[PDB]
Design a protein around this ligand. Structure first.
Ligand code: NA
Length: 380
């Protein structure tokens, strides 16, 4: 059983034993196909962008606030203006999509190595990690001072919101763990990766840009805690992880969930169903991490009934009901988010099996048998 924090380690180990069973074989085959596609990809880096942040160092990560667009009423489009839920394709010019491609590839490859034992996949993953994190010529500095810059705003600086850009590192770390016994993922590679994340954690605890994210009242602030906890554990700082976990119900859950389960700061968005689910999934990621340390975040309940269960119970009636009945905005991705909701229910069922959540999810889910999520959130 591997030391995973986001992924349920014992379940995953059983799915691996049963990789060739009829239940898992289609998904394993698709996973190895995805890994074969990743073998073809040239590892990107923060050096690929044409622009450089206002530090003048190309090795600094730079991205753009995704919902910020040129203002047609202004001569040069500046300053940009916000269109909540509408992603400006200009963001592709900077580092965000390269980081995404890298993180997804390493995750795919590490999972492929875990399930198959084929060393080629771990060797490619280590190539991505060298290029992105460790090689002097191409590496990303371990900070997000210039995360989610916005043209014409914030005096060229990034902002706390940029922290969300790296949220997938929570999962990537589990994929690295899963590859540690590969030949390619050496003690030197491991040390380099732990040193990078140690520096990132130092920056997260000191920087004023990171502090902006820590103070955030919505999904950003909840996600900050999850990332801090996961990176603390990866770097051996169990005490910081424990502290962040113990403070999480009062700081995040009871602040952001109303007694009827509503998450008002998410429901006010143009993608209110999407953000309700985004935050619930991050809550469940914290529950998963916390469970590995014997901390029961899932059942944490305030005196007035705020809890993850309340938040789930708000959502459930809308699953399988048409958009007409959802009294908030959801400007895109309705069917996609309905499907995601069904997998929220699978994940919740791990913590509260008697609630009948999987039966509800199974009633409305149309997820093909070969999708990776069947492997990661199995019923083992
Ligand atoms: Na190794």
């Amino acid at each position: 059983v591997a030391n995973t924090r986001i992924y349920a380690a014992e379940k995953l180990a059983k799915v691996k034993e049963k990789a060739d069973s009829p239940l898992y074989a289609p998904a394993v085959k698709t996973l190895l196909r995805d890994a074969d596609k990743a073998l073809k990809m040239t590892p990107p880096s923060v050096m690929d962008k044409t622009m450089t942040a206002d530090s003048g160092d190309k090795h600094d990560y730079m991205s753009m606030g995704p919902y910020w667009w040129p203002d047609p009423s202004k001569p040069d489009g500046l300053p940009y203006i916000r269109k909540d839920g509408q992603r400006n394709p200009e963001l592709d010019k900077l580092d965000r999509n390269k980081l995404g491609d890298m993180s997804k590839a390493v995750t795919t490859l590490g999972l492929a190595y875990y399930f198959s034992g084929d060393e080629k996949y771990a060797q490619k993953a280590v190539d991505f990690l060298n290029v992105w994190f460790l090689d002097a010529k191409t590496k990303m500095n371990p900070h997000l001072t210039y995360g989610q810059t916005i043209p014409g705003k914030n005096k060229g600086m990034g902002r706390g919101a940029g922290m969300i850009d790296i949220y997938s590192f929570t999962e990537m770390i589990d994929a690295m763990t899963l590859m540690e016994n590969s030949k390619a993922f050496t003690p030197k590679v491991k040390k380099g990766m732990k040193e990078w994340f140690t520096q990132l954690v130092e920056w997260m605890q000191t920087s004023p840009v990171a502090a902006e994210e820590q103070r955030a009242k919505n999904n950003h602030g909840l996600a900050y805690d999850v990332q801090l906890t996961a990176y603390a554990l990866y770097t051996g700082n169990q005490d910081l992880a424990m502290k962040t976990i113990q403070e999480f119900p009062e700081k995040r859950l009871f602040a952001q969930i109303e007694p009827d389960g509503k998450q008002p700061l998410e429901l006010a968005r143009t993608t209110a169903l999407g953000y309700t689910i985004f935050n619930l999934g991050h809550m469940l990621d914290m529950c998963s991490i916390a469970s590995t340390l014997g901390q029961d975040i899932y059942n944490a309940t305030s005196q007035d009934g705020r809890s993850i269960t309340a938040a789930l119970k708000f959502l459930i009636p809308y699953i399988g009901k048409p958009q007409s009945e959802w009294p908030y905005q959801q400007i895109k991705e309705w069917d996609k988010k309905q499907e995601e909701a069904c997998w929220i229910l699978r994940r919740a069922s791990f913590f509260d099996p008697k609630a009948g959540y999987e039966a509800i999810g199974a009633q409305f889910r149309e997820t093909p048998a070969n999708k990776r999520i069947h492997l990661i959130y199995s019923l083992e």
